[PDB]
Amino acid sequence: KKKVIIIGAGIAGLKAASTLHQNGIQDCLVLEARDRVGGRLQTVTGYQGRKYDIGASWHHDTLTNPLFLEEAQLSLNDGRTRFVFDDDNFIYIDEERGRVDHDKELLLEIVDNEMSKFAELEFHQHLGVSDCSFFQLVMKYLLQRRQFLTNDQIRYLPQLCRYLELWHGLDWKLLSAKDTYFGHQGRNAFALNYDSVVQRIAQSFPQNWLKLSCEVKSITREPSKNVTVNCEDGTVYNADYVIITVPQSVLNLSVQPEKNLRGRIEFQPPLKPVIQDAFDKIHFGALGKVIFEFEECCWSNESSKIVTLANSTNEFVEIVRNAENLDELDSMLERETSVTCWSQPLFFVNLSKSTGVASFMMLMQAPLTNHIESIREDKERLFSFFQPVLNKIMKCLDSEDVIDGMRPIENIANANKPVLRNIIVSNWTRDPYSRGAYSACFPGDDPVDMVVAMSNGQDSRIRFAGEHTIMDGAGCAYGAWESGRREATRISDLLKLEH
Amino acid sequence: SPAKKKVIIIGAGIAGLKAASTLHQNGIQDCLVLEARDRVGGRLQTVTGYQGRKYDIGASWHHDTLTNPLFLEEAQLSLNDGRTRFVFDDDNFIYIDEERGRVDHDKELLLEIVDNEMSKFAELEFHQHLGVSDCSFFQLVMKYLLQRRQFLTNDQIRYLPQLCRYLELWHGLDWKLLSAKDTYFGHQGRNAFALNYDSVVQRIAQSFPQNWLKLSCEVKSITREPSKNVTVNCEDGTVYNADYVIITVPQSVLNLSVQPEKNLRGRIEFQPPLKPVIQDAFDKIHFGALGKVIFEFEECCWSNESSKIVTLANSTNEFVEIVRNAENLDELDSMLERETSVTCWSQPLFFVNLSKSTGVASFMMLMQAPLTNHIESIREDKERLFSFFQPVLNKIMKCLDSEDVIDGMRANKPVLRNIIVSNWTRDPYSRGAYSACFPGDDPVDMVVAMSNGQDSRIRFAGEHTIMDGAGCAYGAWESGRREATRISDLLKLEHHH
Ligand SMILES: Cc1cc2nc3c(=O)[nH]c(=O)nc-3n(C[C@H](O)[C@H](O)[C@H](O)COP(=O)(O)OP(=O)(O)OC[C@H]3O[C@@H](n4cnc5c(N)ncnc54)[C@H](O)[C@@H]3O)c2cc1C
Ligand SMILES: Cc1cc2nc3c(=O)[nH]c(=O)nc-3n(C[C@H](O)[C@H](O)[C@H](O)COP(=O)(O)OP(=O)(O)OC[C@H]3O[C@@H](n4cnc5c(N)ncnc54)[C@H](O)[C@@H]3O)c2cc1C
């Protein structure tokens, strides 16, 4: 009875439905499992009503990002602020040494740039001759260029370069080296409300099209020119075309046994082998977020980008200087516990400079993400965990130790002391409808496979959309947005041509 | 009577020297290296100044150290004997504007950040694309500004265009003369400042029979005897006959060959004349004029925060309003036209603070065309030079926590003891710095014509005859190795049964 049934109300599904309406097609649905739209785009509220995108926050590749350009046109026409360019010079902090950024002797940023060029030459034309982990690649660089690196450069550079872990959401021993470096097509623009983007799109079509709390449990299309979809409860539907936009990791459940898994869809017939094979090419990263809200800013706003480096040792240097080769370096590196805020790099966005708000938006990676999100309810433990890194930042920013006021006790003796009032944590890895952040590469993965399979679709009536179904903007909000327009337009042309 | 030689190499620059080095390495005997000047090295020349201080007035850096083959050789040497042959002197750039002072790493201007976006803008503009017309670098920057105006602050629109111009000192061409297609490009790793490029020249020169080198002989003509013999005449009248010749004269000097008048210094008369494919290539490639000036001071009495300093050319707010009001590329290109001499603030200038990198109290400054030609044309008037650069020198000292300079060519103040200038645009054996592109230029042409040769016996080498390392010391180096190796392969058959 329906022209098109869109599964999932994330940006992919919403743009699609928005596009269909825009082209005059009627009688369409949008089945969302959650009781809200937005998918991995969620803006939450905390202390004093401040808002934060606990999901996607930035407009990437602003030079060609069509979604951004659309947002730009709007703002150009009405003068309203919808975003801010918050790129800035990064401040790097080592627990013991303090700041190490833009240093007249360490010059870490410069060797970091040679490092990147190194990775490029390494996989250039050879189909990534036996890929390895980002970690293995950095060690190869160090061994090969030690003659031209000082002791401190060999010590801090590898800890600094790991900021890239916050781009992929994966530890450097788990990340594929071939996909580590990417093409930054322009500056980034912090969205001053991705929810505003969600609402504008969400409203571009008939409200009655949306069906929240509809967990699709099975999709089938008996050869008769019709596709039949069923949600968990019991309601059934049928349409001419269907666009599946669930995340990759959820759609990956369709291959295993036990339709018991929350989110998993039952395809009949089963998704063709070219699709199932794609999942063997790894995927799914775990970018997480922790928001630190203070009463007010009493620290320096020199920069909005701050990164704390995991501890490092001088013995590491000695080992590098002495390794005869890659193997000797590998084993020689045998340090045979307990994770702390200094066991991995952490990315903090100082929102005071870019947005005025006195809070820090922090990014974390797997395996830390899963752990921190597991104890998201225990605010006390959370504060104790991050307190040491939160204190080093304040010291490096002309302030002092943080005071714990999550259980407030108004005291005049806090005038110029930073007072923490609330802590917010993401939960993507524990949410059955997301099970992580976005597609990422493990050593040996090939992202293109899935793009082709997804884009080709199960068949003429079963199409796919989402951040894991396109090449440009892969794993990005604008990527999913465009993929949603892709399928809608394809189906939109076909319908017009019939009648 | 004219002496017989297996191979004759014309020119003793690095290309010619590495050619000889390779030939000897492969057991080839009875060769010859003929050089017009009274020294070896060509565009690799280290001079002496105040108190015996040394400076490379030609090439001074090893570029692309991740893959640069000449650099790797020198590094293996230092790794074995522990002698200092080079120093990685890359640093954070200090940018200075005459009115505003330092504008680098500025928390509000963020010039370096949008400069990077510019690079990507340029990259998306050309790279991989077919049928894209070229333009000047200047024009490319104007387009960027117009298209991204909505996301740039007034001060970013004023100063970014002036900072982008540090690239002029990489090509030796003013932004309006420089082809945008050839402006940007990746560098394979950090640069390494040679602590005597002349030490590299000597090592290669000493790696082959010393009786092969014949300095002070300017070659006037090359003739191919249709019988496997090439006749070469020196100006002093000596005549030679060789099986092969490797011609490494600068591209600007070889260009004289395709013109009437054989009395110009360095010109070679070719019989038969250079094939049509070669002459014609001279239209699709040009020559830039990177130039230098060494300012020697008594002692360092200034901040050593960085070894890299760049003074931007003056800018105006009227430029901003025009960019803001422009309605399109045409209006902007038009609006940009008003109603006046050249000073040290009319173009960007690059200064290398040697005190930090080498501990020597001097500045090595790079200049570009057209300024280069004008400054070299007065290198003799030292007072005129000091007056011309005094304002930028003062501004730099102020920014490095010091005071105005004191003319001391005749306590805590900087005293200029000497000024040294380059002479490449005037030296008839150079006629400029190195190969460069003007909008519409296609360097691939010359490389192909040169690497293909005049014929089987008449070959070419030099910085203008190869892609990888084009314009660089290691490109000329490799090109020499290439022609020598080819000749060795051919002479190999001489021992087949
Ligand atoms: C912490 C974090 C930070 C990020 N930051 C950025 C950033 O700064 N910039 C950027 O560009 N991208 C960012 N991303 C990625 C971006 O959020 C995603 O690419 C994008 O939201 C994916 O859109 P989508 O429409 O495909 O799916 P949305 O999740 O992304 O999901 C599709 C919809 O399917 C629904 N669904 C799932 N299972 C079922 C079922 N069985 N039945 C019915 N409905 C179902 C879901 O509930 C969901 O609403 C970030 C992601 C994370 C996790
Ligand atoms: C100011 C300046 C700065 C530079 N800086 C760098 C740098 O930092 N890094 C880098 O890699 N490169 C740099 N270069 C470029 C580098 O110096 C050249 O690429 C390289 O030296 C060219 O070598 P060549 O052997 O081809 O020619 P050499 O000049 O370059 O010339 C070949 C030889 O031919 C001789 N000759 C000419 N005509 C005749 C004739 N008729 N008879 C006999 N002999 C003749 C000449 O006298 C000369 O010795 C710079 C160049 C200049 C001008």
Side-chain angles (χ1 to χ4, degrees), chain A residues 8 10-12 32-34 39-40 55-58 60 214 216 245 263 287 437-438 466-467 475-477 480:
Chain A
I11 190 157
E32 175 50 80
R34 294 195 176 83
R40 275 164 286 171
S57 283
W58 290 281
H60 293 300
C214 210
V216 171
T245 74
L287 188 65
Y438 44 92
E467 59 83 359
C476 287

PDB file of all heavy atoms in Angstrom, chain A residues 8 10-12 32-34 39-40 55-58 60 214 216 245 263 287 437-438 466-467 475-477 480, ligand 1, unseen atoms left out:
ATOM      1  N   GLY A   8      14.502   3.346   9.662  1.00  0.00           N
ATOM      2  CA  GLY A   8      15.511   4.109  10.377  1.00  0.00           C
ATOM      3  C   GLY A   8      15.277   5.590  10.150  1.00  0.00           C
ATOM      4  O   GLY A   8      15.132   6.034   9.003  1.00  0.00           O
ATOM      5  N   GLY A  10      17.389   8.121  11.045  1.00  0.00           N
ATOM      6  CA  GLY A  10      18.638   8.846  11.242  1.00  0.00           C
ATOM      7  C   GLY A  10      18.721   9.856  10.100  1.00  0.00           C
ATOM      8  O   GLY A  10      17.751   9.993   9.340  1.00  0.00           O
ATOM      9  N   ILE A  11      19.846  10.549   9.938  1.00  0.00           N
ATOM     10  CA  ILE A  11      19.931  11.541   8.869  1.00  0.00           C
ATOM     11  C   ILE A  11      19.751  10.949   7.470  1.00  0.00           C
ATOM     12  O   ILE A  11      19.209  11.605   6.575  1.00  0.00           O
ATOM     13  CB  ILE A  11      21.254  12.345   8.929  1.00  0.00           C
ATOM     14  CG1 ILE A  11      21.175  13.517   7.938  1.00  0.00           C
ATOM     15  CG2 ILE A  11      22.437  11.447   8.610  1.00  0.00           C
ATOM     16  CD1 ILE A  11      22.109  14.680   8.261  1.00  0.00           C
ATOM     17  N   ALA A  12      20.184   9.708   7.287  1.00  0.00           N
ATOM     18  CA  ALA A  12      20.049   9.035   6.000  1.00  0.00           C
ATOM     19  C   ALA A  12      18.566   8.828   5.705  1.00  0.00           C
ATOM     20  O   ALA A  12      18.048   9.294   4.683  1.00  0.00           O
ATOM     21  CB  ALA A  12      20.776   7.692   6.030  1.00  0.00           C
ATOM     22  N   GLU A  32      11.055   3.824  12.768  1.00  0.00           N
ATOM     23  CA  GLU A  32      12.186   3.997  13.675  1.00  0.00           C
ATOM     24  C   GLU A  32      11.991   3.165  14.949  1.00  0.00           C
ATOM     25  O   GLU A  32      10.926   3.204  15.560  1.00  0.00           O
ATOM     26  CB  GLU A  32      12.322   5.482  14.034  1.00  0.00           C
ATOM     27  CG  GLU A  32      13.387   5.796  15.077  1.00  0.00           C
ATOM     28  CD  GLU A  32      14.718   5.155  14.754  1.00  0.00           C
ATOM     29  OE1 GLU A  32      15.450   5.699  13.909  1.00  0.00           O
ATOM     30  OE2 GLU A  32      15.026   4.097  15.335  1.00  0.00           O
ATOM     31  N   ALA A  33      13.017   2.416  15.344  1.00  0.00           N
ATOM     32  CA  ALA A  33      12.941   1.586  16.544  1.00  0.00           C
ATOM     33  C   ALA A  33      12.870   2.416  17.841  1.00  0.00           C
ATOM     34  O   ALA A  33      12.073   2.117  18.724  1.00  0.00           O
ATOM     35  CB  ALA A  33      14.135   0.625  16.595  1.00  0.00           C
ATOM     36  N   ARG A  34      13.700   3.455  17.945  1.00  0.00           N
ATOM     37  CA  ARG A  34      13.725   4.330  19.122  1.00  0.00           C
ATOM     38  C   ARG A  34      12.464   5.170  19.184  1.00  0.00           C
ATOM     39  O   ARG A  34      11.664   5.174  18.248  1.00  0.00           O
ATOM     40  CB  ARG A  34      14.917   5.292  19.071  1.00  0.00           C
ATOM     41  CG  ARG A  34      16.310   4.663  19.168  1.00  0.00           C
ATOM     42  CD  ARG A  34      17.325   5.761  19.474  1.00  0.00           C
ATOM     43  NE  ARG A  34      18.684   5.269  19.673  1.00  0.00           N
ATOM     44  CZ  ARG A  34      19.534   5.017  18.686  1.00  0.00           C
ATOM     45  NH1 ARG A  34      19.159   5.216  17.427  1.00  0.00           N
ATOM     46  NH2 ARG A  34      20.752   4.569  18.958  1.00  0.00           N
ATOM     47  N   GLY A  39      18.845   9.312  15.160  1.00  0.00           N
ATOM     48  CA  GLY A  39      19.815   8.231  15.128  1.00  0.00           C
ATOM     49  C   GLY A  39      21.064   8.571  15.913  1.00  0.00           C
ATOM     50  O   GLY A  39      20.993   8.878  17.105  1.00  0.00           O
ATOM     51  N   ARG A  40      22.217   8.519  15.254  1.00  0.00           N
ATOM     52  CA  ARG A  40      23.462   8.834  15.930  1.00  0.00           C
ATOM     53  C   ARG A  40      23.681  10.340  16.050  1.00  0.00           C
ATOM     54  O   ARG A  40      24.771  10.799  16.383  1.00  0.00           O
ATOM     55  CB  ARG A  40      24.638   8.138  15.241  1.00  0.00           C
ATOM     56  CG  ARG A  40      24.841   6.690  15.739  1.00  0.00           C
ATOM     57  CD  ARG A  40      25.737   5.855  14.823  1.00  0.00           C
ATOM     58  NE  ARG A  40      25.049   5.470  13.589  1.00  0.00           N
ATOM     59  CZ  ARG A  40      25.641   4.892  12.541  1.00  0.00           C
ATOM     60  NH1 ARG A  40      26.946   4.622  12.561  1.00  0.00           N
ATOM     61  NH2 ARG A  40      24.924   4.599  11.462  1.00  0.00           N
ATOM     62  N   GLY A  55      26.428  12.944  20.038  1.00  0.00           N
ATOM     63  CA  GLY A  55      26.714  12.140  18.861  1.00  0.00           C
ATOM     64  C   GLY A  55      27.591  12.992  17.956  1.00  0.00           C
ATOM     65  O   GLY A  55      28.566  13.567  18.426  1.00  0.00           O
ATOM     66  N   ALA A  56      27.248  13.098  16.677  1.00  0.00           N
ATOM     67  CA  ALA A  56      28.032  13.923  15.759  1.00  0.00           C
ATOM     68  C   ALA A  56      28.004  15.398  16.174  1.00  0.00           C
ATOM     69  O   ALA A  56      26.976  15.911  16.609  1.00  0.00           O
ATOM     70  CB  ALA A  56      27.507  13.775  14.332  1.00  0.00           C
ATOM     71  N   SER A  57      29.142  16.070  16.026  1.00  0.00           N
ATOM     72  CA  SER A  57      29.264  17.480  16.379  1.00  0.00           C
ATOM     73  C   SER A  57      29.791  18.388  15.273  1.00  0.00           C
ATOM     74  O   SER A  57      29.402  19.554  15.203  1.00  0.00           O
ATOM     75  CB  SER A  57      30.183  17.649  17.592  1.00  0.00           C
ATOM     76  OG  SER A  57      29.521  17.300  18.790  1.00  0.00           O
ATOM     77  N   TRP A  58      30.673  17.865  14.423  1.00  0.00           N
ATOM     78  CA  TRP A  58      31.289  18.673  13.360  1.00  0.00           C
ATOM     79  C   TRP A  58      30.878  18.450  11.913  1.00  0.00           C
ATOM     80  O   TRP A  58      30.529  17.347  11.506  1.00  0.00           O
ATOM     81  CB  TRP A  58      32.815  18.510  13.385  1.00  0.00           C
ATOM     82  CG  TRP A  58      33.507  19.120  14.550  1.00  0.00           C
ATOM     83  CD1 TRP A  58      33.808  20.441  14.736  1.00  0.00           C
ATOM     84  CD2 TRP A  58      33.966  18.431  15.714  1.00  0.00           C
ATOM     85  NE1 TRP A  58      34.427  20.615  15.951  1.00  0.00           N
ATOM     86  CE2 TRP A  58      34.535  19.397  16.573  1.00  0.00           C
ATOM     87  CE3 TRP A  58      33.952  17.087  16.116  1.00  0.00           C
ATOM     88  CZ2 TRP A  58      35.084  19.064  17.815  1.00  0.00           C
ATOM     89  CZ3 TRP A  58      34.500  16.753  17.357  1.00  0.00           C
ATOM     90  CH2 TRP A  58      35.057  17.741  18.189  1.00  0.00           C
ATOM     91  N   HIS A  60      32.443  18.170   8.591  1.00  0.00           N
ATOM     92  CA  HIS A  60      33.766  17.916   8.025  1.00  0.00           C
ATOM     93  C   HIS A  60      33.845  18.282   6.530  1.00  0.00           C
ATOM     94  O   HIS A  60      32.822  18.492   5.882  1.00  0.00           O
ATOM     95  CB  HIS A  60      34.138  16.437   8.195  1.00  0.00           C
ATOM     96  CG  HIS A  60      34.333  16.018   9.620  1.00  0.00           C
ATOM     97  ND1 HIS A  60      35.286  16.584  10.439  1.00  0.00           N
ATOM     98  CD2 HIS A  60      33.717  15.065  10.363  1.00  0.00           C
ATOM     99  CE1 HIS A  60      35.249  15.999  11.624  1.00  0.00           C
ATOM    100  NE2 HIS A  60      34.306  15.075  11.605  1.00  0.00           N
ATOM    101  N   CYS A 214       9.062   1.339  16.320  1.00  0.00           N
ATOM    102  CA  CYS A 214       8.694   0.287  15.377  1.00  0.00           C
ATOM    103  C   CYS A 214       9.985  -0.451  15.103  1.00  0.00           C
ATOM    104  O   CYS A 214      10.746  -0.068  14.213  1.00  0.00           O
ATOM    105  CB  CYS A 214       8.191   0.882  14.062  1.00  0.00           C
ATOM    106  SG  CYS A 214       6.960  -0.075  13.100  1.00  0.00           S
ATOM    107  N   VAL A 216      11.669  -2.969  13.354  1.00  0.00           N
ATOM    108  CA  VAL A 216      11.517  -3.895  12.239  1.00  0.00           C
ATOM    109  C   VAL A 216      12.245  -5.184  12.599  1.00  0.00           C
ATOM    110  O   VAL A 216      13.412  -5.154  12.986  1.00  0.00           O
ATOM    111  CB  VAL A 216      12.121  -3.310  10.958  1.00  0.00           C
ATOM    112  CG1 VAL A 216      12.158  -4.367   9.867  1.00  0.00           C
ATOM    113  CG2 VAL A 216      11.305  -2.107  10.515  1.00  0.00           C
ATOM    114  N   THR A 245      18.193   1.781   6.366  1.00  0.00           N
ATOM    115  CA  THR A 245      19.277   2.664   6.783  1.00  0.00           C
ATOM    116  C   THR A 245      19.856   2.341   8.151  1.00  0.00           C
ATOM    117  O   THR A 245      20.558   3.173   8.734  1.00  0.00           O
ATOM    118  CB  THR A 245      18.834   4.140   6.793  1.00  0.00           C
ATOM    119  OG1 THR A 245      17.978   4.379   7.917  1.00  0.00           O
ATOM    120  CG2 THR A 245      18.081   4.470   5.518  1.00  0.00           C
ATOM    121  N   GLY A 263      17.281  -5.438  17.398  1.00  0.00           N
ATOM    122  CA  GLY A 263      17.697  -4.726  16.205  1.00  0.00           C
ATOM    123  C   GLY A 263      17.787  -5.586  14.960  1.00  0.00           C
ATOM    124  O   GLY A 263      17.386  -5.155  13.879  1.00  0.00           O
ATOM    125  N   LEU A 287      34.098   5.505  19.088  1.00  0.00           N
ATOM    126  CA  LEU A 287      34.328   6.864  19.576  1.00  0.00           C
ATOM    127  C   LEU A 287      33.308   7.183  20.678  1.00  0.00           C
ATOM    128  O   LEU A 287      32.100   7.007  20.495  1.00  0.00           O
ATOM    129  CB  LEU A 287      34.185   7.871  18.433  1.00  0.00           C
ATOM    130  CG  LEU A 287      34.581   9.307  18.779  1.00  0.00           C
ATOM    131  CD1 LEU A 287      36.070   9.361  19.093  1.00  0.00           C
ATOM    132  CD2 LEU A 287      34.250  10.231  17.610  1.00  0.00           C
ATOM    133  N   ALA A 437      30.157   3.495  17.278  1.00  0.00           N
ATOM    134  CA  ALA A 437      30.099   4.805  16.652  1.00  0.00           C
ATOM    135  C   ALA A 437      29.810   4.820  15.159  1.00  0.00           C
ATOM    136  O   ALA A 437      28.717   5.189  14.721  1.00  0.00           O
ATOM    137  N   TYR A 438      30.812   4.435  14.377  1.00  0.00           N
ATOM    138  CA  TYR A 438      30.702   4.393  12.923  1.00  0.00           C
ATOM    139  C   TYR A 438      31.786   3.473  12.380  1.00  0.00           C
ATOM    140  O   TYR A 438      32.769   3.186  13.068  1.00  0.00           O
ATOM    141  CB  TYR A 438      30.879   5.793  12.331  1.00  0.00           C
ATOM    142  CG  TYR A 438      32.026   6.552  12.947  1.00  0.00           C
ATOM    143  CD1 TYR A 438      33.309   6.500  12.390  1.00  0.00           C
ATOM    144  CD2 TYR A 438      31.842   7.290  14.116  1.00  0.00           C
ATOM    145  CE1 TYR A 438      34.376   7.167  12.990  1.00  0.00           C
ATOM    146  CE2 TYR A 438      32.901   7.957  14.723  1.00  0.00           C
ATOM    147  CZ  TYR A 438      34.160   7.894  14.157  1.00  0.00           C
ATOM    148  OH  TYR A 438      35.191   8.568  14.756  1.00  0.00           O
ATOM    149  N   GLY A 466      22.889   5.191   4.467  1.00  0.00           N
ATOM    150  CA  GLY A 466      23.589   5.332   5.735  1.00  0.00           C
ATOM    151  C   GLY A 466      25.054   5.677   5.513  1.00  0.00           C
ATOM    152  O   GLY A 466      25.544   5.618   4.384  1.00  0.00           O
ATOM    153  N   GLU A 467      25.764   6.022   6.582  1.00  0.00           N
ATOM    154  CA  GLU A 467      27.166   6.405   6.465  1.00  0.00           C
ATOM    155  C   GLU A 467      28.112   5.305   5.973  1.00  0.00           C
ATOM    156  O   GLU A 467      29.253   5.584   5.610  1.00  0.00           O
ATOM    157  CB  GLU A 467      27.670   6.994   7.794  1.00  0.00           C
ATOM    158  CG  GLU A 467      27.573   6.077   9.004  1.00  0.00           C
ATOM    159  CD  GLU A 467      28.738   5.115   9.125  1.00  0.00           C
ATOM    160  OE1 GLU A 467      29.628   5.141   8.253  1.00  0.00           O
ATOM    161  OE2 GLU A 467      28.765   4.326  10.095  1.00  0.00           O
ATOM    162  N   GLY A 475      31.348   7.201   6.757  1.00  0.00           N
ATOM    163  CA  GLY A 475      31.381   7.344   8.199  1.00  0.00           C
ATOM    164  C   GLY A 475      31.070   8.752   8.683  1.00  0.00           C
ATOM    165  O   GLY A 475      31.275   9.050   9.852  1.00  0.00           O
ATOM    166  N   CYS A 476      30.578   9.621   7.804  1.00  0.00           N
ATOM    167  CA  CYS A 476      30.262  10.995   8.201  1.00  0.00           C
ATOM    168  C   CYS A 476      28.776  11.355   8.054  1.00  0.00           C
ATOM    169  O   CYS A 476      28.048  10.770   7.247  1.00  0.00           O
ATOM    170  CB  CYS A 476      31.104  12.000   7.392  1.00  0.00           C
ATOM    171  SG  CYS A 476      32.895  12.118   7.804  1.00  0.00           S
ATOM    172  N   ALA A 477      28.335  12.331   8.841  1.00  0.00           N
ATOM    173  CA  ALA A 477      26.948  12.771   8.790  1.00  0.00           C
ATOM    174  C   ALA A 477      26.542  13.142   7.364  1.00  0.00           C
ATOM    175  O   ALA A 477      25.520  12.663   6.869  1.00  0.00           O
ATOM    176  CB  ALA A 477      26.731  13.965   9.732  1.00  0.00           C
ATOM    177  N   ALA A 480      26.003  10.097   5.141  1.00  0.00           N
ATOM    178  CA  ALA A 480      24.703   9.436   5.292  1.00  0.00           C
ATOM    179  C   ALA A 480      23.577  10.265   4.662  1.00  0.00           C
ATOM    180  O   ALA A 480      22.687   9.718   4.008  1.00  0.00           O
ATOM    181  CB  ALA A 480      24.411   9.176   6.774  1.00  0.00           C
TER     182      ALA A 480
HETATM  183  C1  LIG C   1      30.331   9.741  19.340  1.00  0.00           C
HETATM  184  C2  LIG C   1      30.144   9.969  17.850  1.00  0.00           C
HETATM  185  C3  LIG C   1      30.599  11.170  17.271  1.00  0.00           C
HETATM  186  C4  LIG C   1      30.457  11.449  15.917  1.00  0.00           C
HETATM  187  N1  LIG C   1      30.900  12.660  15.415  1.00  0.00           N
HETATM  188  C5  LIG C   1      30.743  12.976  14.070  1.00  0.00           C
HETATM  189  C6  LIG C   1      31.157  14.230  13.569  1.00  0.00           C
HETATM  190  O1  LIG C   1      31.678  15.100  14.300  1.00  0.00           O
HETATM  191  N2  LIG C   1      30.942  14.475  12.219  1.00  0.00           N
HETATM  192  C7  LIG C   1      30.353  13.562  11.336  1.00  0.00           C
HETATM  193  O2  LIG C   1      30.194  13.857  10.181  1.00  0.00           O
HETATM  194  N3  LIG C   1      29.950  12.332  11.820  1.00  0.00           N
HETATM  195  C8  LIG C   1      30.133  12.043  13.157  1.00  0.00           C
HETATM  196  N4  LIG C   1      29.687  10.804  13.642  1.00  0.00           N
HETATM  197  C9  LIG C   1      29.048   9.859  12.670  1.00  0.00           C
HETATM  198  C10 LIG C   1      27.597  10.246  12.319  1.00  0.00           C
HETATM  199  O3  LIG C   1      26.894  10.433  13.533  1.00  0.00           O
HETATM  200  C11 LIG C   1      26.958   9.117  11.475  1.00  0.00           C
HETATM  201  O4  LIG C   1      27.673   8.935  10.257  1.00  0.00           O
HETATM  202  C12 LIG C   1      25.508   9.327  10.999  1.00  0.00           C
HETATM  203  O5  LIG C   1      24.669   9.796  12.055  1.00  0.00           O
HETATM  204  C13 LIG C   1      24.955   8.007  10.452  1.00  0.00           C
HETATM  205  O6  LIG C   1      23.617   8.262   9.992  1.00  0.00           O
HETATM  206  P1  LIG C   1      22.560   7.137   9.633  1.00  0.00           P
HETATM  207  O7  LIG C   1      21.382   7.901   9.175  1.00  0.00           O
HETATM  208  O8  LIG C   1      23.107   6.150   8.657  1.00  0.00           O
HETATM  209  O9  LIG C   1      22.208   6.288  10.949  1.00  0.00           O
HETATM  210  P2  LIG C   1      21.639   6.665  12.423  1.00  0.00           P
HETATM  211  O10 LIG C   1      22.023   5.965  13.660  1.00  0.00           O
HETATM  212  O11 LIG C   1      23.029   7.078  12.417  1.00  0.00           O
HETATM  213  O12 LIG C   1      20.868   5.243  12.412  1.00  0.00           O
HETATM  214  C14 LIG C   1      19.895   4.792  11.459  1.00  0.00           C
HETATM  215  C15 LIG C   1      18.575   4.585  12.306  1.00  0.00           C
HETATM  216  O13 LIG C   1      18.202   3.198  12.286  1.00  0.00           O
HETATM  217  C16 LIG C   1      17.435   2.943  13.462  1.00  0.00           C
HETATM  218  N5  LIG C   1      17.313   1.478  13.631  1.00  0.00           N
HETATM  219  C17 LIG C   1      18.307   0.584  13.999  1.00  0.00           C
HETATM  220  N6  LIG C   1      17.866  -0.673  14.052  1.00  0.00           N
HETATM  221  C18 LIG C   1      16.528  -0.594  13.702  1.00  0.00           C
HETATM  222  C19 LIG C   1      15.516  -1.585  13.570  1.00  0.00           C
HETATM  223  N7  LIG C   1      15.713  -2.876  13.782  1.00  0.00           N
HETATM  224  N8  LIG C   1      14.247  -1.159  13.191  1.00  0.00           N
HETATM  225  C20 LIG C   1      14.009   0.185  12.958  1.00  0.00           C
HETATM  226  N9  LIG C   1      14.933   1.176  13.066  1.00  0.00           N
HETATM  227  C21 LIG C   1      16.174   0.741  13.439  1.00  0.00           C
HETATM  228  C22 LIG C   1      18.258   3.660  14.536  1.00  0.00           C
HETATM  229  O14 LIG C   1      17.605   3.790  15.791  1.00  0.00           O
HETATM  230  C23 LIG C   1      18.668   4.942  13.825  1.00  0.00           C
HETATM  231  O15 LIG C   1      17.902   6.069  14.185  1.00  0.00           O
HETATM  232  C24 LIG C   1      29.829  10.484  15.036  1.00  0.00           C
HETATM  233  C25 LIG C   1      29.367   9.267  15.599  1.00  0.00           C
HETATM  234  C26 LIG C   1      29.511   9.003  16.990  1.00  0.00           C
HETATM  235  C27 LIG C   1      28.975   7.693  17.528  1.00  0.00           C
END
